[PDB]
Amino acid sequence: GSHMISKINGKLFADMIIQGAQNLSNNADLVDSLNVYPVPDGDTGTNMNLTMTSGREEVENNLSKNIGELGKTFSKGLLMGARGNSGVILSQLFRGFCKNIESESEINSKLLAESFQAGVETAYKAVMKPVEGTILTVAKDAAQAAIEKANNTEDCIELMEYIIVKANESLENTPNLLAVLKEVGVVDSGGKGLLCVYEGFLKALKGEKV
Ligand SMILES: Nc1ncnc2c1ncn2[C@@H]1O[C@H](COP(=O)(O)O)[C@@H](O)[C@H]1O
Ligand SMILES: [Mg+2]
Ligand SMILES: [Mg+2]
Ligand SMILES: [Mg+2]
C-alpha cells in the first residue's frame, strides 16, 4: 500500500490517547448535557474528561515506543483518577485493553480488535449490575465490529473507521434499551463520550491532530 497503518507502536498509541483525550475534552460540555442516567446530574463529560486527562498526563510525561509499557502508564493514570460511573467504566475498559498488550512492543489490527474485546470483558466483570443502553453496550458493539472487520483488514485506519461506524449505530440504538433515554430523547452520555475518544483514536491513526 502506502498510507496504511499495519502496526501501532507505543508513540502511535500515545498519539491516539492524546487525541482521544483532546477530542473528549472538546466535547465535554455536550456529553455533560446528555447525562440523564442513572442520576440526571449533567456531569458525564466532566467525569470522563477528568479521568482521561489523568491518563493523558501520565502518558505525556512517560513516553515510550514500546506499546506494552505505554499501556501500563496509560492504564495506571486512568485507574488512579477515575471519576463517576463513566470514568470508572472507562478506566476498566482500558485496563483490560492495556493488559492484553502488556508484553508487546507493537500490535497489528487483529490484536487491536482483540484488545477492545478484552476491555469489554474486564468492564462487564467490574460492574456489579451492568445495564444495557450504556457505555458498556456501545463498547461491546464496537468490539464485536472490530473483531469481525479485523479478520480481513490489515489496515488499522480502515478498522478504526469501521469500529466508529458500528459504535455510532449502537449509540443511536441506546434509547431502545434504556427507557429514560427514549422518554427524554437523547442517546447515552457515557457512550457518547466513548465515541468521542474513539474518534480521536482515528485522527491519530491518520497522522492528524484534533
Ligand atoms: N450499571 C451501569 N451499567 C452500565 N453503564 C452504566 C451503569 N451506570 C452508569 N453507567 C454509564 O455511566 C454514564 C453516566 O456516568 P456518570 O455521569 O459519570 O455517572 C451513563 O450514561 C452510562 O453510560
Ligand atoms: Mg458529579
Ligand atoms: Mg452523571
Ligand atoms: Mg495522514
CSV table of C-alpha atoms and ligand atoms in Angstrom, one decimal:
chain,number,residue,atom,x,y,z
A,1,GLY,CA,0.0,0.0,0.0
A,2,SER,CA,1.4,3.3,1.2
A,3,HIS,CA,-0.5,5.4,3.8
A,4,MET,CA,-1.9,2.5,5.7
A,5,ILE,CA,-1.2,1.5,9.4
A,6,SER,CA,0.0,-2.1,9.7
A,7,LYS,CA,1.3,-1.8,13.3
A,8,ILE,CA,0.8,0.5,16.2
A,9,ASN,CA,3.9,1.2,18.3
A,10,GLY,CA,3.9,3.0,21.7
A,11,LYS,CA,4.2,6.5,20.2
A,12,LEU,CA,1.3,5.9,17.9
A,13,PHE,CA,-0.8,4.6,20.8
A,14,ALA,CA,0.2,7.7,22.8
A,15,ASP,CA,-1.0,9.8,19.9
A,16,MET,CA,-4.3,8.0,20.0
A,17,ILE,CA,-4.5,8.6,23.7
A,18,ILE,CA,-3.7,12.3,23.4
A,19,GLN,CA,-6.0,13.0,20.5
A,20,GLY,CA,-8.8,10.9,22.1
A,21,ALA,CA,-8.5,12.8,25.3
A,22,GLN,CA,-8.4,16.1,23.4
A,23,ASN,CA,-11.5,15.3,21.4
A,24,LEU,CA,-13.3,14.3,24.5
A,25,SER,CA,-12.3,17.5,26.3
A,26,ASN,CA,-13.6,19.5,23.3
A,27,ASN,CA,-17.0,17.7,23.6
A,28,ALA,CA,-17.2,17.5,27.4
A,29,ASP,CA,-19.9,20.1,27.7
A,30,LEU,CA,-22.1,18.3,25.1
A,31,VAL,CA,-21.6,14.9,26.9
A,32,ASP,CA,-22.5,16.7,30.1
A,33,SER,CA,-25.8,18.0,28.7
A,34,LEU,CA,-26.9,14.4,27.8
A,35,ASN,CA,-26.4,12.9,31.2
A,36,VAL,CA,-29.8,11.8,32.5
A,37,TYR,CA,-28.9,8.3,33.7
A,38,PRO,CA,-28.6,6.9,36.4
A,39,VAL,CA,-28.9,10.3,38.1
A,40,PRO,CA,-29.5,13.3,35.8
A,41,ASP,CA,-26.7,15.4,37.3
A,42,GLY,CA,-25.2,16.5,34.0
A,43,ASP,CA,-21.6,15.6,34.7
A,44,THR,CA,-20.6,12.6,32.5
A,45,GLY,CA,-18.4,14.7,30.2
A,46,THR,CA,-16.6,16.3,33.1
A,47,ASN,CA,-16.2,12.9,34.7
A,48,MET,CA,-14.8,11.2,31.6
A,49,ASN,CA,-12.7,14.3,30.7
A,50,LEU,CA,-11.0,14.3,34.1
A,51,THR,CA,-10.4,10.6,34.1
A,52,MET,CA,-8.9,10.6,30.6
A,53,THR,CA,-6.8,13.7,31.4
A,54,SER,CA,-5.3,11.7,34.2
A,55,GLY,CA,-4.2,9.0,31.8
A,56,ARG,CA,-3.1,11.5,29.2
A,57,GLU,CA,-0.9,13.4,31.7
A,58,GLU,CA,0.8,10.2,32.7
A,59,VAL,CA,1.5,9.2,29.1
A,60,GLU,CA,2.8,12.7,28.1
A,61,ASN,CA,5.3,12.6,30.9
A,62,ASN,CA,6.5,9.0,30.4
A,63,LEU,CA,6.5,8.3,26.6
A,64,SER,CA,7.7,5.0,25.2
A,65,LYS,CA,7.9,3.4,21.8
A,66,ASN,CA,7.0,0.0,23.5
A,67,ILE,CA,3.2,-0.1,23.4
A,68,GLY,CA,3.0,-2.5,26.3
A,69,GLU,CA,4.9,-0.2,28.6
A,70,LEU,CA,3.0,2.8,27.3
A,71,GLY,CA,-0.3,1.0,28.0
A,72,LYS,CA,0.8,0.4,31.6
A,73,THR,CA,1.4,4.1,32.1
A,74,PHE,CA,-1.9,5.0,30.5
A,75,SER,CA,-3.8,2.3,32.5
A,76,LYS,CA,-2.4,3.5,35.8
A,77,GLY,CA,-3.2,7.1,35.0
A,78,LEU,CA,-6.9,6.3,34.4
A,79,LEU,CA,-7.3,4.0,37.3
A,80,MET,CA,-5.9,6.5,39.9
A,81,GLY,CA,-8.2,9.3,38.7
A,82,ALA,CA,-11.4,7.6,37.7
A,83,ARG,CA,-14.5,9.8,38.4
A,84,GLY,CA,-18.1,8.8,38.3
A,85,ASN,CA,-19.8,5.8,36.7
A,86,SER,CA,-18.4,6.7,33.3
A,87,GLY,CA,-14.8,7.3,34.3
A,88,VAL,CA,-14.7,4.1,36.4
A,89,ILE,CA,-16.1,2.1,33.4
A,90,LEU,CA,-13.7,3.9,31.0
A,91,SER,CA,-10.7,3.1,33.2
A,92,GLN,CA,-11.8,-0.5,33.4
A,93,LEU,CA,-12.3,-0.8,29.6
A,94,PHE,CA,-8.8,0.4,29.1
A,95,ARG,CA,-7.4,-1.6,32.0
A,96,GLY,CA,-8.4,-4.7,30.1
A,97,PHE,CA,-7.3,-3.2,26.7
A,98,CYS,CA,-3.8,-2.4,28.0
A,99,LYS,CA,-3.4,-5.7,29.9
A,100,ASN,CA,-4.0,-7.6,26.7
A,101,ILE,CA,-0.9,-5.9,25.1
A,102,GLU,CA,1.3,-5.6,28.1
A,103,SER,CA,4.1,-7.7,26.7
A,104,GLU,CA,4.1,-6.2,23.1
A,105,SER,CA,6.2,-3.6,21.5
A,106,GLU,CA,3.7,-3.1,18.7
A,107,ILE,CA,0.3,-4.5,17.7
A,108,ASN,CA,-1.4,-5.2,14.4
A,109,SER,CA,-5.1,-4.9,13.5
A,110,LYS,CA,-6.1,-8.3,14.9
A,111,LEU,CA,-4.5,-7.7,18.2
A,112,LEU,CA,-6.1,-4.2,18.3
A,113,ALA,CA,-9.5,-5.7,17.9
A,114,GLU,CA,-8.8,-8.4,20.5
A,115,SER,CA,-7.7,-5.7,22.9
A,116,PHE,CA,-11.0,-3.8,22.5
A,117,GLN,CA,-12.8,-7.1,23.2
A,118,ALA,CA,-10.6,-7.8,26.3
A,119,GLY,CA,-11.5,-4.4,27.6
A,120,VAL,CA,-15.2,-5.1,27.3
A,121,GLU,CA,-14.8,-8.3,29.2
A,122,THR,CA,-12.9,-6.5,32.0
A,123,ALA,CA,-15.5,-3.8,32.3
A,124,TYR,CA,-18.6,-6.1,32.3
A,125,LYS,CA,-17.0,-8.1,35.2
A,126,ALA,CA,-16.1,-4.9,37.1
A,127,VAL,CA,-19.7,-3.5,37.1
A,128,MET,CA,-21.7,-5.4,39.7
A,129,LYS,CA,-25.1,-4.7,38.0
A,130,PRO,CA,-24.5,-3.9,34.3
A,131,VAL,CA,-27.2,-2.1,32.5
A,132,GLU,CA,-27.8,-2.1,28.7
A,133,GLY,CA,-28.2,1.0,26.6
A,134,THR,CA,-25.0,2.4,28.1
A,135,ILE,CA,-21.2,2.9,27.6
A,136,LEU,CA,-21.0,-0.9,28.1
A,137,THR,CA,-23.4,-1.6,25.2
A,138,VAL,CA,-21.5,0.8,22.9
A,139,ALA,CA,-18.1,-0.7,23.9
A,140,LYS,CA,-19.4,-4.2,23.4
A,141,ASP,CA,-20.9,-3.5,19.9
A,142,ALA,CA,-17.7,-1.6,18.9
A,143,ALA,CA,-15.6,-4.6,19.9
A,144,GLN,CA,-17.8,-7.0,18.1
A,145,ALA,CA,-17.4,-4.9,14.9
A,146,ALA,CA,-13.6,-4.7,15.4
A,147,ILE,CA,-13.2,-8.4,15.7
A,148,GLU,CA,-15.4,-9.1,12.6
A,149,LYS,CA,-13.6,-6.5,10.5
A,150,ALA,CA,-10.0,-7.3,11.5
A,151,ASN,CA,-10.0,-10.9,10.2
A,152,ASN,CA,-9.9,-9.5,6.6
A,153,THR,CA,-8.5,-5.9,7.2
A,154,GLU,CA,-4.8,-5.4,7.9
A,155,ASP,CA,-5.1,-1.6,7.8
A,156,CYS,CA,-5.7,-0.2,11.3
A,157,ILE,CA,-7.2,3.0,9.8
A,158,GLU,CA,-9.9,1.2,7.9
A,159,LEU,CA,-10.5,-0.9,11.0
A,160,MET,CA,-11.0,2.2,13.2
A,161,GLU,CA,-13.3,3.7,10.7
A,162,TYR,CA,-15.5,0.6,10.7
A,163,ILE,CA,-15.4,0.5,14.5
A,164,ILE,CA,-16.7,4.1,14.6
A,165,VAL,CA,-19.5,3.4,12.1
A,166,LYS,CA,-20.8,0.5,14.1
A,167,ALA,CA,-20.3,2.2,17.5
A,168,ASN,CA,-22.4,5.1,16.2
A,169,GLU,CA,-25.1,2.7,15.2
A,170,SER,CA,-25.0,1.1,18.7
A,171,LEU,CA,-25.1,4.6,20.3
A,172,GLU,CA,-28.1,5.6,18.2
A,173,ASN,CA,-29.9,2.5,19.4
A,174,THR,CA,-29.3,3.0,23.1
A,175,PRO,CA,-32.7,4.7,23.6
A,176,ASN,CA,-34.4,1.4,22.6
A,177,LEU,CA,-32.7,-0.4,25.5
A,178,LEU,CA,-32.9,2.2,28.3
A,179,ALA,CA,-36.4,3.7,28.9
A,180,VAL,CA,-35.3,7.1,30.3
A,181,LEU,CA,-33.2,7.8,27.1
A,182,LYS,CA,-36.2,7.4,24.8
A,183,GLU,CA,-38.6,9.3,27.1
A,184,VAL,CA,-36.2,12.3,27.2
A,185,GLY,CA,-35.0,11.9,23.6
A,186,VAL,CA,-31.2,11.5,24.0
A,187,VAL,CA,-28.5,8.9,23.4
A,188,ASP,CA,-26.4,7.6,26.3
A,189,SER,CA,-23.9,10.2,27.6
A,190,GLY,CA,-21.3,7.6,28.6
A,191,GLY,CA,-21.5,6.0,25.1
A,192,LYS,CA,-21.3,9.4,23.5
A,193,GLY,CA,-18.1,10.2,25.5
A,194,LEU,CA,-16.6,6.9,24.5
A,195,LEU,CA,-17.3,7.6,20.8
A,196,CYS,CA,-15.5,10.9,21.3
A,197,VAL,CA,-12.4,9.1,22.4
A,198,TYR,CA,-12.7,6.6,19.5
A,199,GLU,CA,-12.9,9.4,17.0
A,200,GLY,CA,-9.6,10.9,18.4
A,201,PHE,CA,-8.1,7.4,18.0
A,202,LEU,CA,-8.9,7.6,14.3
A,203,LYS,CA,-7.5,11.1,14.0
A,204,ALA,CA,-4.2,9.9,15.4
A,205,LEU,CA,-4.1,6.8,13.2
A,206,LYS,CA,-4.3,9.1,10.2
A,207,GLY,CA,-1.4,11.2,11.5
A,208,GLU,CA,-3.8,14.1,12.4
A,209,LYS,CA,-4.3,16.4,15.3
A,210,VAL,CA,-7.7,17.3,16.9
B,1,LIG,N1,-24.9,0.0,35.8
B,1,LIG,C1,-24.4,0.5,34.7
B,1,LIG,N2,-24.1,-0.2,33.6
B,1,LIG,C2,-23.5,0.3,32.5
B,1,LIG,N3,-23.3,1.6,32.4
B,1,LIG,C3,-23.5,2.5,33.4
B,1,LIG,C4,-24.1,2.0,34.6
B,1,LIG,N4,-24.3,3.1,35.4
B,1,LIG,C5,-23.8,4.1,34.7
B,1,LIG,N5,-23.4,3.8,33.5
B,1,LIG,C6,-22.8,4.7,32.5
B,1,LIG,O1,-22.4,5.9,33.1
B,1,LIG,C7,-22.9,7.0,32.4
B,1,LIG,C8,-23.0,8.2,33.4
B,1,LIG,O2,-21.8,8.4,34.0
B,1,LIG,P1,-21.6,9.5,35.2
B,1,LIG,O3,-22.5,10.7,34.8
B,1,LIG,O4,-20.2,9.8,35.3
B,1,LIG,O5,-22.2,8.8,36.4
B,1,LIG,C9,-24.2,6.5,31.8
B,1,LIG,O6,-24.7,7.3,30.7
B,1,LIG,C10,-23.9,5.1,31.4
B,1,LIG,O7,-23.2,5.0,30.1
B,2,MG,MG,-20.9,14.6,39.8
B,3,MG,MG,-23.7,11.9,36.0
B,4,MG,MG,-2.4,11.1,7.3
